Amino acid sequence: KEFRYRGYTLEQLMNMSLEELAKLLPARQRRSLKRGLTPEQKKLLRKIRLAKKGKYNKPIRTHCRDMIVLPEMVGLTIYVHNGKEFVPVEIKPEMIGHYLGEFAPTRKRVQHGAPGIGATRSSM
Amino acid sequence: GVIRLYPDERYVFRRSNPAIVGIEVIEGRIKPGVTLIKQNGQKVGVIRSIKSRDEFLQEAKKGQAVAIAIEGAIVGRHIHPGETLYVDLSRDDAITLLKHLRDTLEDTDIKALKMIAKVKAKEDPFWRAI
RNA sequence: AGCGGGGUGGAGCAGCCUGGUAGCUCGUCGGGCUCAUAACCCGAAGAUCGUCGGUUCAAAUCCGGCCCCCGCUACCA
RNA sequence: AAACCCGCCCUCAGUUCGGAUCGCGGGCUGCAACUCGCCCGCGUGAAGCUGGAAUCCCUAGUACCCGCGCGUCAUCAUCGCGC
RNA sequence: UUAAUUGGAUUCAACGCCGGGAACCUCACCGGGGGCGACGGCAGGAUGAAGGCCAGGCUGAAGGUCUUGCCGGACGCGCCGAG
Numbered sequence: 019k020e021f022r023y024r025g026y027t028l029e030q031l032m033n034m035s036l037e038e039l040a041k042l043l044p045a046r047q048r049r050s051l052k053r054g055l056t057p058e059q060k061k062l063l064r065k066i067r068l069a070k071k072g073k074y075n076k077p078i079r080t081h082c083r084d085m086i087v088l089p090e091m092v093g094l095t096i097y098v099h100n101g102k103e104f105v106p107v108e109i110k111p112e113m114i115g116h117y118l119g120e121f122a123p124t125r126k127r128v129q130h131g132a133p134g135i136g137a138t139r140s141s142m
Numbered sequence: 143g144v145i146r147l148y149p150d151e152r153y154v155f156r157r158s159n160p161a162i163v164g165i166e167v168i169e170g171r172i173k174p175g176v177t178l179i180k181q182n183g184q185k186v187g188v189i190r191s192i193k194s195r196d197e198f199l200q201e202a203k204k205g206q207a208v209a210i211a212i213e214g215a216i217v218g219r220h221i222h223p224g225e226t227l228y229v230d231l232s233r234d235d236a237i238t239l240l241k242h243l244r245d246t247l248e249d250t251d252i253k254a255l256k257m258i259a260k261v262k263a264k265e266d267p268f269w270r271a272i
Numbered sequence: 273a274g275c276g277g278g279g280u281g282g283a284g285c286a287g288c289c290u291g292g293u294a295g296c297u298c299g300u301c302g303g304g305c306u307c308a309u310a311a312c313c314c315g316a317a318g319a320u321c322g323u324c325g326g327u328u329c330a331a332a333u334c335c336g337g338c339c340c341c342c343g344c345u346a347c348c349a
Numbered sequence: 350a351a352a353c354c355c356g357c358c359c360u361c362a363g364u365u366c367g368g369a370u371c372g373c374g375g376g377c378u379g380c381a382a383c384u385c386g387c388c389c390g391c392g393u394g395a396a397g398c399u400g401g402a403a404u405c406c407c408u409a410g411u412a413c414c415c416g417c418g419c420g421u422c423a424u425c426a427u428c429g430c431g432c
Numbered sequence: 433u434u435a436a437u438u439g440g441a442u443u444c445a446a447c448g449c450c451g452g453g454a455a456c457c458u459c460a461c462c463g464g465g466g467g468c469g470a471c472g473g474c475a476g477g478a479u480g481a482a483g484g485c486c487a488g489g490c491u492g493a494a495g496g497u498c499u500u501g502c503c504g505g506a507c508g509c510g511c512c513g514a515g
């Protein structure tokens with residue numbers, strides 16, 4: 019009932035080089051990692067590692083909706099911009115390999131009202 | 143006025159044209175020429191005459207039994223024995239009673255009017271707010 | 273109280289008799305036609321026959337007790 | 350180039366018809382592919398059995414059927430203009 | 433329906449139309465952050481205007497601002513007209 023990603027425990031995933039890990043993710047993530055991180059993602063990763071070290075005890079808010087979730091990010095809470103606000107996301111082990119923006123919906127669910135004038139041929 | 147028919151077969155002395163049946167008063171005052179209605183409001187007709195005995199009467203107060211001869215009411219389809227009958231009320235009359243003629247109102251009258259308003263509070267919100 | 277009739281889509285009627293499909297008119301929703309509205313044309317939704325049981329190869333039909341209203345006269349406190 | 354031609358399998362069936370929808374995996378462009386791109390392999394297998402009242406285009410290398418080029422364009426054509 | 437789902441066009445003569453196949457840009461919309469006043473004059477200004485920066489906070493990120501002090505020398509939106 020424990021967590022395993024390709025037959026590897028969480029600890030084994032922690033002690034892996036970036037290149038080693040990329041061989042287990044899908045093709046899209048492997049290509050994205052192979053091309054390197056953008057500067058904004060570099061700053062976000064620096065803040066994340068600083069928080070892991072025991073410093074920076076503040077909320078982590080970001081605009082980087084295209085950041086890929088990494089094993090070392092598990093256990094934290096991140097606030098991802100959705101267009102008008104930062105929503106909290108609690109990272110679970112099963113989120114490895116997904117984009118952050120997948121957990122911050124940008125549109126509100128639709129509840130239709132009564133059709134108005136012009137909705138049918140006879141209503142015009 | 144609110145009354146209840148006897149569950150007794152004896153009090154029924156004529157079925158139709160006219161309907162002659164005894165009654166005991168629960169609350170209020172019975173007068174000739176007053177329309178009676180049920181909970182659903184069917185027009186059972188207008189009381190044609192009242193008689194406690196062979197003698198002719200004029201009105202009945204609390205705790206008095208009287209045989210009513212009414213028009214437009216038939217046992218069974220229109221009225222059933224042991225069923226409770228209500229006097230139809232005018233909202234203007236109710237306002238007058240509650241505001242103008244508030245001196246001549248007693249326990250039985252106010253109880254009858256209150257429960258009549260509660261019963262009639264089905265279609266017009268005026269009786270719902272009383 | 274006794275005699276007599278009938279229960280079928282939202283609405284109003286046939287269809288029983290002679291069992292074996294639930295049809296008519298109106299209303300509701302959608303589409304055509306016209307520059308556009310009414311009129312007109314087409315399609316769809318809506319009752320599995322008031323309840324229980326019996327009968328019958330098979331019952332909206334044949335049958336009953338049962339739910340209801342309708343009709344009549346009887347009935348003078 | 351395809352429609353076209355030759356040989357073998359299927360024989361009137363929701364099928365060896367139809368390929369929508371979804372799972373796993375592999376790629377390309379790009380500073381960036383989740384919202385919101387395109388391509389490939391295996392798997393899955395929806396409605397649909399010819400269409401009421403109505404209504405459109407076309408007179409000769411024309412209409413029908415079949416593919417291709419250019420524009421847009423880093424990537425993307427069930428489109429427009431041409432062949 | 434929504435924070436916004438930018439706008440024009442409604443019979444022929446609006447609806448694969450605006451060459452409109454929008455991931456950024458396009459962009460005109462929504463949330464948030466910065467910057468801009470030739471030329472006249474008013475306060476001010478070498479005893480230094482206007483302006484710029486190492487590190488560190490605020491921040492989505494930022495000498496944008498603040499902390500901490502180092503720069504540069506003649507104009508001056510703190511104010512009124514005007515652009």
Ligand code: MET
Nearest residue numbers: 164194195207208209
């Ligand atoms: C009739 O005879 C007379 N008893 C009517 C009143 S009944 C209580």
Ligand SMILES: [Mg+2]
Nearest residue numbers: 306309310311
């Ligand atoms: Mg019309």
Ligand SMILES: [Mg+2]
Nearest residue numbers: 365366367368
């Ligand atoms: Mg096939």
Ligand SMILES: [Mg+2]
Nearest residue numbers: 382383384385
């Ligand atoms: Mg995607």
Ligand SMILES: [Mg+2]
Nearest residue numbers: 361362363398
């Ligand atoms: Mg077929």
Ligand SMILES: [Mg+2]
Nearest residue numbers: 428448452453
């Ligand atoms: Mg186009």
Ligand SMILES: [Mg+2]
Nearest residue numbers: 425453454455
């Ligand atoms: Mg596009």
Ligand SMILES: [Mg+2]
Nearest residue numbers: 454456457459
């Ligand atoms: Mg854009």
